[PDB]
Design a protein around this ligand. Structure first.
Ligand SMILES: CCc1nc(N)nc(N)c1-c1ccc2c(c1)N(CCCOC)C(=O)[C@](C)(c1cc(F)cc(F)c1)O2
Ligand SMILES: CCc1nc(N)nc(N)c1-c1ccc2c(c1)N(CCCOC)C(=O)[C@](C)(c1cc(F)cc(F)c1)O2
Lengths: 336, 336
């Protein structure tokens, strides 16, 4: 009978991270809570300073923790936008009043691109042990083993960005869901398969037409991804209907065209989940001379997880998301 | 025991709108939530494409909704600026986690001036049944009937526009208010009568002297109007005292001089509600080589409602507003 809310910071609507403590005394780290991966890692004090990303981030020093336990097994974590490498270490980790003995990665190789653009230091995988590298027990499995949570679930609220600092960037509840940050009722979709936060998606419509995901596709619900992503061929067609021009990494429209772009809907479990243009364009201007980025990207995720769409922070911002380990399902409700 | 919020989009500080769903399944429309009118309406699928506005808006297709019930009674809705016509239909409307069977207008006539400029598709009238054309029961009355709301009130937050954020454009709350977007406590002013969201104003001060509305006048609190307005005469005097001159269509001031302009105070229920020049000058720049318009316009509203001042989006931006149907009054508090 315990819940645990961790307050998240929202950087520019693209990064959402909260604080954890590792060691004794606690060394604090900004970390993304990430259902698209299953390992915990933070930068290490053994990371050569020729990696400038390690110069600009908090580094874990095992020599300052009395509760540290050595392992030393090498590990590499491959994310869709970048890679980190290092070795395994055990210590106590605090996540919102819960304390857990956890195996995590001390990262000694941390590419400047993209990690010099990271406001966060590391990542907390909220995914399953089946996708864990080195078969390291994920942190939420260790918390479940304590038997202190009311429900074996966790939930994500990602707020819109704000100019002031009185609005919360977001929130992860461990052991439940916060009714202050959603309205209406949860609508649940079973996982295709345990081991991945991935569900069946029946269709994707853009405007007055269902031009995408005909006959079906996959949808990984990914709190560690900034954007909604689809396959390269799915997105070239999505962005033809929008009128966006393919820039280097992102897509863009003329800023004045932003508000008139069509609704994009996502058919999940007998319910339509609809984003307006306000939800997926970074409306920085109304000028026909400036360019505005869309919060939708192309990403070709390889098997066995893909090929699939990924519903990242663009989607979760609109729909409060409950991840349910007990019944292997994902619930969505309108965020507030 | 229930509250229901809808996040709103701010377009250029002159349009504010959020999502509703009509039908089964729900079709998504952007609507202005409008205390200065009492009818719901969205564009119709039957709307001829000769009206260019219908080509560039979302259309309600009654054939694609299993909850739709027919009723072809005609109606014309006349606003200050534009005019639309159509016929009545019945269906379920989703307003932020609340569902309610509602009579609204499917619109088949939709002039380019001004509805081509409308970033919203339709309007949700939050006014009283007394000003409802066709005697149609307004949506808030139907929601009161299902008896789920905490209080018989609804509130409006309209945010300032910022080009360097993806900020909350605004927020309506049905059944209460959100203290995150105001400070202190509400002070209320009773309506003159039920049926119109219209209060007594005891004067409008420009700086020190109380130059206008000396012997009292009226004030519509209108969430569907973009500006504060007064009669052509009252605005003439106000603008002469501000040092503003009629450019061609609008009143302007040198952008650099904007900050020198005096406060404007609206005396409502024994308190002074004060906008600074930052609140009522659109400072697109501060250049001494450019002109800047004011968010206050002349508008001769005809009887029986007029002639009156109207406190539109300019005013609501400054003061979070709570519309209290139980007590027939309006509460203001400083927005944040
Ligand atoms: C968290 C680890 C993670 N987990 C899964 N499942 N997917 C991705 N893409 C990532 C990931 C990796 C690296 C990475 C990020 C995400 N994020 C997004 C954080 C999301 O917060 C919720 C970034 O912002 C950053 C700095 C990045 C910035 C950038 F401008 C372009 C990039 F390609 C990557 O670097
Ligand atoms: C909501 C319906 C409404 N309700 C009442 N009470 N008054 C007015 N004037 C209106 C109204 C009618 C039409 C109309 C608008 C408001 N608004 C303002 C939306 C306000 O959002 C908070 C418009 O922006 C628009 C497109 C318009 C653009 C323009 F450049 C000149 C116009 F005359 C009208 O067209």
């Amino acid at each position: 009978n315990t819940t645990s809310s961790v307050i998240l910071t929202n950087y520019m609507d693209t990064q959402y991270y909260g604080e954890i403590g590792i060691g004794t005394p606690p060394q604090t780290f900004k970390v993304v809570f990430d259902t698209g991966s299953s390992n915990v890692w933070v930068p290490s004090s053994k990371c050569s300073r020729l990696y400038t990303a390690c110069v600009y981030h908090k580094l874990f020093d095992a020599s300052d923790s009395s509760s540290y336990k050595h392992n030393g097994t090498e590990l590499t974590l491959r994310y869709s936008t970048g890679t980190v490498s290092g070795f395994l270490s055990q210590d106590i980790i605090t996540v919102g009043g819960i304390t857990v003995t956890q195996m995590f990665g001390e990262v000694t190789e941390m590419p400047a691109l993209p990690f010099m653009l990271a406001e966060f230091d590391g990542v907390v995988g909220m995914g399953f042990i089946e996708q864990a590298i080195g078969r390291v027990t994920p942190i939420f499995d260790n918390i479940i083993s304590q038997g202190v949570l009311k429900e074996d679930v966790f939930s994500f609220y990602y707020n819109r960005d704000s100019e002031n600092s009185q609005s919360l960037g977001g929130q992860i509840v461990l052991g439940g869901s916060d009714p202050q940050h959603y309205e209406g009722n949860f609508h649940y979709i079973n996982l295709i398969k345990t081991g991945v936060w991935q569900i069946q998606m029946k269709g994707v419509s853009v405007g007055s037409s269902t031009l995408l995901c005909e006959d079906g596709c996959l949808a990984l619900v990914d709190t560690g991804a900034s954007y909604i992503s689809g396959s390269t061929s799915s997105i070239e067609k999505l962005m033809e209907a929008l009128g966006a021009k393919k820039r280097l990494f992102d897509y863009v429209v003329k800023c004045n065209e932003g508000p008139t772009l069509p609704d994009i809907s996502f058919h999940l479990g007998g319910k339509e989940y609809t984003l307006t243009s306000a939800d997926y364009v970074f409306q920085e201007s109304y000028s026909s001379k400036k360019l505005c980025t869309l919060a939708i990207h192309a990403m070709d995720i390889p098997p066995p997880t893909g090929p699939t769409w990924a519903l990242g922070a663009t989607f979760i911002r609109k729909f409060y998301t409950e991840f349910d380990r007990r019944n292997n399902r994902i619930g969505f409700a309108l965020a507030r």
